[PDB]
């Protein structure tokens, strides 16, 4: 069952070749990982401690870990409301890992054929076994996350086979102890406990909204390259604007600088930020000389 | 060509490229790809969905006691084909489209078959869409005259009234002697768009058979086999009460088998009586 | 994995029962037509997840003699047509060759039915 | 002697172009001297080109043709083998005029400008200044003019006349449906000018395929540009049913409607059909005006057809208006 | 057998006798000239292999006398149907939900055939080689024809015959001609020698 | 017309899919036996890598030409070409929400000196809300009319093709040919054709559509130096489009094309009074205050309709009482069925 070559007219096996598959799995070979260090992530530091402890600590300290005599933890599922720090913790953790890593998407695994979706996850974990030790990030499991149901006329079974062959080169038979998994899903209620067997996917780490201090920190992070006035106050930029999920705060900075150059000054101020907010949402609503 | 379906080739001097018409398979481009001669036409498209859906069974005049019905369907299926002259002088525009509503059995797939082939018209059935709309019209046009037949399923949302109108939209403005036929079990179950007088120029009605019509259909299906010196078939028709076309072919075959069980070569009286006394289920 | 019934915890009824139904016809087959009936063939390990399913057959894998055909049911199916049926007739004919044998097809909803009406390519192939 | 260099083709060029030429569908055209061709098998082929071929049908990739031994793009695919064979691009026109419609006159006048006047006299508008309006909807009650009659008459004094219907728009197998109106407004767009009929769009009988399909008559109607794409005439019985997204008086322009008949068109439309017939002594309106307390446009078509047929069963082209009563109870009672 | 049909010339020494329209006949390598007709080489006759009695079937009486009536009785008493008038019914369709009397009644029919009870499960009619299968199942039908009287038993048809096909990508471009010419093959045997096509399926 | 001498030195060539390099490398013809082969004479060993496709000859089965990737169904989408004739001076009645849209779409222009100057990266996404009367797209035709860039229009149901996973194939393919062009952009018309936010796992009907949309919002932000695809998207429907799509990063600076007020609406018929050979004195603001809560992309039905009244009444000009006859005809009589309070509730 290996991949051994042969002559094209005499048909005798000359030499062997190491086992192969498509480049659709070999496209997941990111080398340009580190530019987002652990300083750009902010306000989530117990999730950084929890994830980074759960992943790259068995990459550098396993034997001490083995001296306690407990099993290395399995894949980590990250989850949060709309957009917090999931993928930024993905390439931030994969930034300073010093291993090999593969940026496997959700809907790369479902295609029109029967064979392809299934063949490429098993060969993805075969790549990770061959090049192990490596960790794998599956972004947006909602692709293979619609779950089993009593299925009359239409149904779906293709995504069922892609998922059910994913979770059995994950926690099927024994040889798991080489390759860790990272998951990231913006929705959790869509998922059956098959993809939650306490072992298939260890610590279900929580991503909340960034709290009362954290958004001030993120507004200090992203606005690090812009020329900011000393007469700035990120704390009132935080405590005024408290529903945002940390992604918009990044923006607040970036189109705050945009309207700061729409004024034409080469240096931004506080009302650029303050006035930059009244732009994240807006949705009009005038004729309010009556809101007293 | 058969395996891989295309090429453009030549034709030899003794082939007279003028008659070789499309969908009439014959070739010889032996090596360089040039024609020689012609072969058996090899049954065009519909020959396929007729012999394939072999559902339509040749029928002629053996209709079991329907004469008002055949008078009305022969009033509107061979007069608009074989005598159009009194329609283009009578002021009538065109009669087309007949709805056959009746109980399951008793007149369907057989009246529209029989008066399709007394006239030798054709009998295209688009009942079902299993293996292959609008392309069928071309075939019908080519046949020149044609008859299209339908399906009746409710019990023995938009099933085939969609295609029904779909071909009444092309059929209304329309190469003219094609006549759609729809059989349904009930007139009330179908669309309000078909309720558009006159979209269905003819609503022929099939009743369940009475005493004498059931002695006629049981007379014919009893004329399929041996009986004896005397039957006097009335006592079997005696309990005909709601019967069905089929409910007659079934009991005549079961009477034949109930004569077959005793290795006997003449269907007696009582095998009918245990046939119709069996099938009351 | 040299996993034994020592690692299987708290389901001694289910594993003594599966062990007896699966290899006890292979230990003493003569007691069954003695009673007067052929032994049963299959068991369906239905349950909530976790719970020791796949493993259970790991413990069966490392405690039996015959070739324990352990397969995931979604590495069966391939993109070519009529290929999976070739694989499954090859599997069961291979079971005819070496006997007695045990064939482990876990997670079987890939081949699991409640057969449909309409997907017509990716489902009627299975 | 300009026809002297033509005969060099059949002794130096047609030896190349004239063999068991193969036909395989063309692909992404690498620049002038080459192209790639997936053949009938599926094997791609980096072919060359021909110098003398007047290349105009390069679109990556309509079924181009090739050479057998060497591989090139020898010819092109005239005899297009037109998809949607039976969409009624009318060559033999039907039999309706300005006269036999004869009823609703305001309406046929308004559609007569809205389709026909950018064809029969296009030199109003740019001399005046406005754009011509797009296609109409023309909804109505059932049998109120044959909605598909004032579009049929809009056929027979114009150029090409392409139609669709709700039934050709929706699909069963599909999963992939909104293709029908992709290449319906691509074939429709190509004629320049052709009129496309969304015949009776009413979308009834999951739901989201119908939703995206309606979204593509919507967007494929008016996305970025348009050729001479007047004739989007929509007949409809249920105007309150369809999603009011079609009319942005852009997607669907000015639109015209009607009350069912009045008695003036009960008379005037009753005497069109029976003008072909032979009844003369007691042509009446007492059995026609207040008989059914409004009778459709068709019910008079079916009363003429069932009338003459019912007096034609007894074989006479005579004038009997008592047989007409049996026709009345026979068709609508 | 290599894909297509294509035109030939046949030699004079062979007689124009055995060339039935499904006669397996040999061709010449590198030439494809016809040389000789062949015995029907193809499926198994199932010599005495399946064993449950028709006495331990249990309960099933009316279905047992209907299948006894319409399968093996018109193969034995083939002419009594030609002494009354009603034809032997051609096929037998067995729809059983969820399955009680399918495959011990079609197993206990196989004892007292004295007839070539050829089995084929209706799932290898699809093969990896394209355009193979129709030739396969017509080999099955003629393999019952030259072994008459025979009982073709093909299981679970809804594997090869459904209501819903797909015009595009050819996973079922060939199974709509597995069913199609089999549907043409069964119509080619109304001359009634002896071949009866009984068939079963869990759901119809 | 004389290419006979050069056809024999062309070598008709078969494209095959290259893979690993040991030298040697493995090709894959997708109909043949995916076999081992080296380079010919002149192509660089750093010119051919995995994944890409090269052409193989048929004589001794060896590679000469490296070849571009395949985009088969999305060739027609591309960046349209030419582009329509309406511009910023046409789509009138807004005046500021152009300028929000304008500064995002027009930074391959002058603008990058400002942004590499005062350290800004510009926003990528733009979203365009409106009821279906405003120039939701008309502005799309303007930014396609002047772009100094590509323009990949891709409308909302060239993605809903019915093989599972295949709609996700066309989206990733679209972003594959999008990255092979510097300073490019893209336009998703009618994106509520991929919505239905994220449903249950019972009778799952939207699921295939979901994953197409899902890979869409994987390409809008995940694991890339991202190029510079200034995405800009226009739909008439709010939150049927779920979160993780509207969130800043992949569609910031959403634009609300509301119905224009009394001042601006004059201006849009001032756009359509660039025609028609109107009367000497005509009261425009009257015609603003008679319709007054219609929609920007209609007043053209007032324009065209009143011109239809003027051509009907055989006049070479356009009065007021055919304007006022028209606003009687396409505001009063065409509000019975034509509804834009139905989408104003949706906003
Ligand atoms: N805590 C945080 N630290 C740094 N950046 C953040 C944080 N939260 C959100 N962001 C911003 O959000 C973007 C990444 O969003 P992400 O959380 O990956 O969305 P998703 O989780 O759906 O992938 C980045 O541009 C990043 O700057
Ligand atoms: N009046 C009749 N004459 C002859 N056969 C009839 C009659 N009524 C019913 N049948 C039987 O019905 C069968 C035809 O089926 P058909 O009537 O088309 O089904 P349906 O009742 O659904 O229309 C024939 O086998 C025929 O013997
Ligand atoms: N009774 C048990 N004892 C020990 N481990 C168990 C038990 N039940 C389930 N497990 C856990 O389940 C894993 C095996 O997978 P399993 O539970 O079979 O999930 P699946 O049924 O999806 O294969 C083992 O690694 C083990 O930790
Ligand atoms: N002058 C007329 N007045 C009223 N009805 C007519 C006239 N001419 C034709 N019709 C009828 O209109 C019908 C076709 O168009 P229409 O009534 O709009 O049907 P639908 O409304 O179902 O599309 C035909 O049945 C025809 O008899
Ligand atoms: N009527 C019956 N009498 C005796 N045994 C039966 C009967 N029906 C089913 N069985 C037994 O139950 C099992 C199931 O048979 P069944 O499901 O009917 O087979 P199939 O599905 O192939 O028709 C068989 O092995 C058979 O021995
Ligand atoms: N400010 C404006 N200036 C000119 N025309 C406008 C303006 N607003 C809307 N329109 C008109 O609306 C139409 C644009 O339609 P569009 O907004 O794309 O509809 P949808 O939003 O449903 O796609 C054009 O005909 C245009 O003239």
Curated annotation (Swiss-Prot), chain A:
Cell location: Cytoplasm; Nucleus
- What does the UniProt PTM comment say about this protein? Sumoylated by UBE2I in response to MEKK1-mediated stimuli.
GO BP of this protein: blastocyst development; modulation by host of viral transcription; positive regulation of proteasomal protein catabolic process; positive regulation of transcription by RNA polymerase II; proteasome-mediated ubiquitin-dependent protein catabolic process
Q: Which keywords does this chain's UniProt record carry?
A: Acetylation, ATP-binding, Cataract, Cytoplasm, Deafness, Host-virus interaction, Intellectual disability, Neuropathy, Nucleotide-binding, Nucleus, Phosphoprotein, Proteasome, Ubl conjugation
Tell me the superkingdom of the source: Eukaryota
Where ATP binds, per the record, is at: 80-87
Q: Which family does it belong to?
A: Belongs to the AAA ATPase family.
Subunit info here reads: Component of the 19S proteasome regulatory particle complex. The 26S proteasome consists of a 20S core particle (CP) and two 19S regulatory subunits (RP). The regulatory particle is made of a lid composed of 9 subunits, a base containing 6 ATPases including PSMC3 and few additional components. Interacts with PAAF1.
Disease entry from the Swiss-Prot or TrEMBL record: Deafness, cataract, impaired intellectual development, and polyneuropathy: An autosomal recessive disease characterized by early onset of deafness, cataract, severe developmental delay, and severely impaired intellectual development. Patients later develop polyneuropathy of the lower extremities, associated with depigmentation of the hair in that area.
Swiss-Prot record, chain D:
Bilayer topology reads:
Lipid-anchor
- Annotated region described as Disordered, given as residue ranges: 1-18
For the keyword NAD, the answer is no
Q: What results from changing residue 233 to T?
A: In BKAH; uncertain significance; contrary to the wild type, it fails to rescue eye defects in Rpt2-null Drosophila
- The main place the protein resides is cytoplasm
What is one process in the GO biological process aspect for this record?
Answer: proteasome-mediated ubiquitin-dependent protein catabolic process
Q: What does this protein do?
A: Component of the 26S proteasome, a multiprotein complex involved in the ATP-dependent degradation of ubiquitinated proteins. This complex plays a key role in the maintenance of protein homeostasis by removing misfolded or damaged proteins, which could impair cellular functions, and by removing proteins whose functions are no longer required. Therefore, the proteasome participates in numerous cellular processes, including cell cycle progression, apoptosis, or DNA damage repair.
Name of this chain's protein: 26S proteasome regulatory subunit 4
Top-level taxonomy: Eukaryota, Metazoa, Chordata, Craniata, Vertebrata
Q: Which gene encodes it?
A: PSMC1
From Swiss-Prot, chain E:
**Where found?**
Cytoplasm; Nucleus
- Which residues are noted in the entry as ATP-binding? 96-103
Q: To which protein family does this belong?
A: Belongs to the AAA ATPase family.
Function of the molecule: Component of the 26S proteasome, a multiprotein complex involved in the ATP-dependent degradation of ubiquitinated proteins. This complex plays a key role in the maintenance of protein homeostasis by removing misfolded or damaged proteins, which could impair cellular functions, and by removing proteins whose functions are no longer required. Therefore, the proteasome participates in numerous cellular processes, including cell cycle progression, apoptosis, or DNA damage repair.
Quaternary state and interactors? Component of the 19S proteasome regulatory particle complex. The 26S proteasome consists of a 20S core particle (CP) and two 19S regulatory subunits (RP). The regulatory particle is made of a lid composed of 9 subunits, a base containing 6 ATPases including PSMC4 and few additional components. Interacts with NR1I3. Interacts with PAAF1. Interacts with TRIM5. Interacts with ZFAND1.
The molecule here is called: 26S proteasome regulatory subunit 6B
Species name: Homo sapiens
The major lineage groups are: Eukaryota, Metazoa, Chordata, Craniata, Vertebrata
Swiss-Prot record, chain F:
Specify the protein name. 26S proteasome regulatory subunit 7
> GO: which molecular function terms?
ATP binding; ATP hydrolysis activity; proteasome-activating activity
Q: What broad class describes the main subcellular location of this protein? A: cytoplasm
Which segments cross the bilayer?
none
The UniProt record gives the binding positions of ATP as 130-137
> Which species is this record about?
Homo sapiens
Q: Its gene?
A: PSMC2
Query: Hey, what's the signal peptide range on this chain?
Result: none
Q: What induces it?
A: Expression is not cell cycle-dependent and occurs throughout the cell cycle.
GO cellular component: a single term: P-body
The Swiss-Prot or TrEMBL record describes its family as follows: Belongs to the AAA ATPase family.
Give residues where N6-acetyllysine occurs: 30, 336
**Lineage: superkingdom:** Eukaryota
Q: Where in the cell is it found?
A: Cytoplasm
Q: How is it modified after translation?
A: Monoubiquitinated by RNF181. Phosphorylated. Dephosphorylated by UBLCP1 which impairs PSMC2 ATPase activity and disrupts 26S proteasome assembly.
Q: Which UniProt keywords apply?
A: Acetylation, ATP-binding, Cytoplasm, Nucleotide-binding, Phosphoprotein, Proteasome, Ubl conjugation
The GO annotation for biological process reads: osteoblast differentiation; positive regulation of proteasomal protein catabolic process; proteasome-mediated ubiquitin-dependent protein catabolic process; ubiquitin-dependent protein catabolic process
Binding partners and assembly:
Component of the 19S proteasome regulatory particle complex. The 26S proteasome consists of a 20S core particle (CP) and two 19S regulatory subunits (RP). The regulatory particle is made of a lid composed of 9 subunits, a base containing 6 ATPases including PSMC2 and few additional components. Interacts with NDC80/HEC; this interaction is detected only during M phase. Interacts and SQSTM1. Interacts with PAAF1. Directly interacts with TRIM5. (Microbial infection) Interacts with HIV-1 Tat.
């Amino acid at each position: 069952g290996d991949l051994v070559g042969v002559n094209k007219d005499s048909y005798l096996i000359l030499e062997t070749l190491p086992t192969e598959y498509d480049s659709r799995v070999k496209a997941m070979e990111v080398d340009e990982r580190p530019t987002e260090q652990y300083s750009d992530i902010g306000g989530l530091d117990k999730q950084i401690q929890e994830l980074v402890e759960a992943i790259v600590l068995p990459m550098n300290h396993k034997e001490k870990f083995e001296n306690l005599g407990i099993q290395p933890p399995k894949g980590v599922l990250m989850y949060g409301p709309p957009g917090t720090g999931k993928t930024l913790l993905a390439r931030a953790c994969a930034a300073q890992t010093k291993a090999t890593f593969l940026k496997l998407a959700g809907p790369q695994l479902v295609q029109m054929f029967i064979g392809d979706g299934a063949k490429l996850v098993r060969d993805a974990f075969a790549l990770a076994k061959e090049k192990a030790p490596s960790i794998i990030f599956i972004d947006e499991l909602d692709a293979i996350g619609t779950k089993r149901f009593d299925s009359e006329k239409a149904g779906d079974r293709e995504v069922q086979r892609t998922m059910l062959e994913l979770l059995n080169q994950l926690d099927g038979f024994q040889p798991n102890t080489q390759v860790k998994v990272i998951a990231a899903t913006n929705r959790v209620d869509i998922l059956d406990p098959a993809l939650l067997r306490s072992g298939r996917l260890d610590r279900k780490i929580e991503f909340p909204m960034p709290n009362e201090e954290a958004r001030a920190r993120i507004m200090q992070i992203h606005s690090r390259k812009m020329n900011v006035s000393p007469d700035v106050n990120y704390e009132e930029l935080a405590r005024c604007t408290d529903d945002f999920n940390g992604a918009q705060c990044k923006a607040v900075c970036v189109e705050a600088g945009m309207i700061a150059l729409r004024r034409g000054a080469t240096e931004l101020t506080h009302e650029d930020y303050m006035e930059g907010i009244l732009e994240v949402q807006a949705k009009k609503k005038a004729n309010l000389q009556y809101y007293a | 060509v058969h395996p891989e379906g295309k090429f453009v080739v030549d034709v030899d001097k003794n082939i007279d490229i003028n008659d070789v018409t499309p969908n009439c398979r014959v070739a010889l481009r032996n090596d360089s790809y040039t024609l020689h001669k012609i072969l058996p036409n090899k049954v065009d498209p519909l020959v396929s969905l007729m012999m394939v859906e072999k559902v339509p069974d040749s029928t002629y005049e053996m209709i079991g006691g329907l004469d008002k019905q055949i008078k009305e369907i022969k009033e509107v299926i061979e007069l608009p084909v074989k005598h159009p002259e009194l329609f283009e002088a009578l002021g009538i525009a065109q009669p087309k489209g007949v709805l056959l509503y009746g109980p399951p059995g008793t007149g369907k797939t057989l009246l529209a078959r029989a008066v399709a082939h007394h006239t030798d018209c054709t009998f295209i059935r688009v009942s079902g869409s299993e293996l292959v709309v609008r392309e069928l019209f071309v075939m019908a046009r080519e046949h020149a005259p044609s008859i299209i037949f339908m399906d009746e399923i409710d019990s023995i949302s938009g099933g085939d009234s969609e295609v029904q109108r779909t071909m009444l939209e092309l059929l209304n403005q329309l190469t003219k002697n094609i006549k759609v036929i729809m059989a349904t079990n009930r007139i009330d179950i179908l669309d309000s768009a078909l309720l558009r007088p006159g979209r269905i120029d003819r609503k022929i009605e099939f009743p369940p058979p009475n005493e004498e019509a059931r002695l006629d259909i049981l007379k014919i299906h009893s004329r399929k086999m041996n009986l004896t010196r005397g039957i006097n078939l009335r006592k079997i028709a005696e309990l005909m009460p709601g019967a069905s076309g089929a409910e007659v072919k079934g009991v005549c075959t079961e009477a034949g088998m109930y004569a077959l069980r005793e290795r006997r070569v003449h269907v007696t009286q009582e095998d009918f009586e245990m046939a119709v006394a069996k099938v009351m289920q | 994995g040299n996993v034994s019934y020592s690692e299987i915890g708290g389901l001694s009824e289910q594993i003594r029962e599966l062990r007896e139904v699966i290899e006890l016809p292979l230990t003493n087959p003569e007691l069954f037509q003695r009673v007067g009936i052929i032994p049963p063939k299959g068991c369906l390990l239905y349950g909530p997840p976790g719970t020791g399913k796949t493993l259970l057959a790991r413990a069966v894998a490392s405690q039996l003699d015959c070739n324990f055909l352990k397969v995931v049911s979604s590495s069966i199916v391939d993109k070519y047509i009529g290929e999976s049926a070739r694989l499954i007739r090859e599997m069961f004919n291979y079971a005819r060759d070496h006997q007695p044998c045990i064939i482990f097809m876990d997670e079987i909803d890939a081949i699991g039915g409640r057969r449909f009406s309409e997907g017509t390519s990716a489902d009627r192939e299975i | 002697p300009l026809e002297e260099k033509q005969e060099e083709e059949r002794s130096k060029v047609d030896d190349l172009r004239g063999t068991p030429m193969s036909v395989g569908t063309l692909e992404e055209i690498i620049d002038d001297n080459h192209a790639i061709v997936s053949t009938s098998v599926g094997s791609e082929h980096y072919v060359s080109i021909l110098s003398f071929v007047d290349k105009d049908l390069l679109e990556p990739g309509c079924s181009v043709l090739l050479n057998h031994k060497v591989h090139a793009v020898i010819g092109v695919l005239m005899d297009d083998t037109d998809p949607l064979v039976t969409v009624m691009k009318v060559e033999k026109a039907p039999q309706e005029t300005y006269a036999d419609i004869g009823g609703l006159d305001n309406q046929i006048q308004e559609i007569k400008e809205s389709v026909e006047l950018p064809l029969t006299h296009p030199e109003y508008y740019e001399e005046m200044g406005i754009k011509p309006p797009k296609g109409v909807i023309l909804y109505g009650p059932p049998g109120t003019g044959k909605t598909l009659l004032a579009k049929a008459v809009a056929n027979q004094t114009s150029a090409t006349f392409l139609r669709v219907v709700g039934s050709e728009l929706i699909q069963k197998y599909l999963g992939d449906g909104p293709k029908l109106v992709r290449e319906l407004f691509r074939v429709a767009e190509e004629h320049a000018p052709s009129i496309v009929f969304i015949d009776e769009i009413d979308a009834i009988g999951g739901e989201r395929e119908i939703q995206r399909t309606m979204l593509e008559l919507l967007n494929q109607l008016d996305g970025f540009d348009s050729r001479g794409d007047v004739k989007v005439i929509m007949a409809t019985n249920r105007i309150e049913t369809l999603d009011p997204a079609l009319i942005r008086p852009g997607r669907i322009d000015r639109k015209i409607e009607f009350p069912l008949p009045d008695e003036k068109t009960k008379k005037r439309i009753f005497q069109i059909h029976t003008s072909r017939m032979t009844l003369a002594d007691d042509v009446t309106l007492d059995d026609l005006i207040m008989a059914k307390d409004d009778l459709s446009g068709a019910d008079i078509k079916a009363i003429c057809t069932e009338a003459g047929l019912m007096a034609l069963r007894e074989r006479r082209m005579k004038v009997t208006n008592e047989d007409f009563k049996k026709s009345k109870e026979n068709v609508l009672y | 057998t290599t894909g297509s049909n294509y035109y030939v010339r046949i030699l004079s020494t062979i007689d124009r006798e055995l060339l039935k329209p499904n006669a397996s006949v040999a061709l010449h390598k590198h030439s494809n000239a016809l040389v000789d007709v062949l015995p029907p080489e193809a499926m198994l006759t199932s010599d005495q292999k399946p064993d449950v009695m028709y006495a331990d079937i249990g309960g099933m009486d009316i279905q047992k006398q209907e299948v006894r009536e319409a399968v093996e009785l018109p193969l034995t008493h083939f002419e009594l149907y030609k002494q009354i008038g009603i034809d032997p019914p051609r096929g037998v369709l067995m729809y059983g939900p969820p399955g009680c009397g399918k495959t011990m009644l079609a197993k206990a029919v196989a004892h007292h055939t004295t007839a070539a009870f050829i089995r084929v499960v209706g799932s290898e009619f699809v093969q990896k080689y394209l355009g193979e299968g129709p030739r396969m199942v017509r080999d099955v039908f003629r393999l019952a024809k030259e072994n008459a009287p025979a009982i073709i038993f093909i299981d679970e048809i809804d594997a090869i015959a459904t209501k819903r096909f797909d015009a595009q990508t050819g996973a079922d471009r060939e199974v709509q001609r597995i069913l199609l010419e089999l549907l043409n093959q069964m119509d080619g045997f109304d001359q009634n020698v002896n071949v009866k096509v009984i068939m079963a399926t869990n759901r119809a | 017309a004389a290419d006979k001498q050069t056809l024999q030195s062309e070598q008709p060539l078969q494209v095959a899919r290259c893979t690993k390099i040991i030298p040697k490398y493995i090709i894959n013809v997708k109909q043949f036996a995916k076999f081992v082969v080296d380079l010919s004479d002149q192509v660089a060993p750093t010119d051919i890598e995995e994944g890409m496709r090269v052409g193989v000859d048929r004589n001794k089965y060896q590679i000469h030409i490296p070849l571009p990737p395949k985009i088969d169904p999305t060739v027609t989408m591309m960046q349209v070409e030419e582009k329509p004739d309406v511009t910023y001076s046409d789509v009138g009645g807004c005046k500021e929400q152009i300028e929000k849209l304008r500064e995002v779409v027009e930074t391959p222009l002058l603008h990058p000196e400002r942004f590499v100057n005062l350290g800004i990266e510009p926003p990528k996404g733009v979203l365009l809300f409106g009821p279906p009367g405003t120039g939701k797209t008309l502005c799309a035709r303007a930014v396609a009319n002047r772009t100094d860039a590509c323009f990949i229009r891709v409308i909302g149901s060239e993605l809903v093709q019915k093989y599972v996973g295949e709609g996700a194939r066309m989206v990733r393919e679209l972003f594959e040919m999008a990255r092979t062009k510097k300073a490019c952009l893209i336009f998703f018309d009618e994106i509520d054709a991929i919505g239905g936010a994220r449903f249950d796992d019972g009778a799952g009907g939207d699921n295939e559509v979901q994953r197409t949309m899902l890979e869409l919002i994987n390409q809008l932000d995940g694991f890339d130096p991202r190029g510079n695809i200034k995405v800009l998207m226009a739909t008439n429907r709010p939150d049927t489009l779920d979160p993780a799509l509207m969130r800043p990063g992949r569609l910031d600076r959403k634009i609300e094309f509301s119905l224009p007020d009394l001042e601006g609406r004059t201006h849009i018929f001032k756009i359509h009074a660039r025609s028609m050979s109107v009367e000497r004195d005509i009261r425009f603001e009257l015609l603003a205050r008679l319709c007054p809560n219609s929609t920007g992309a209609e007043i053209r039905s007032v324009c065209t309709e009143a011109g239809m009244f003027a051509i009907r009444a055989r006049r070479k000009i356009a009065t007021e009482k055919d304007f006022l006859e028209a606003v009687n005809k396409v505001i009063k009589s065409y509000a019975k069925f034509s509804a834009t309070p139905r989408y104003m509730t949706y906003n």
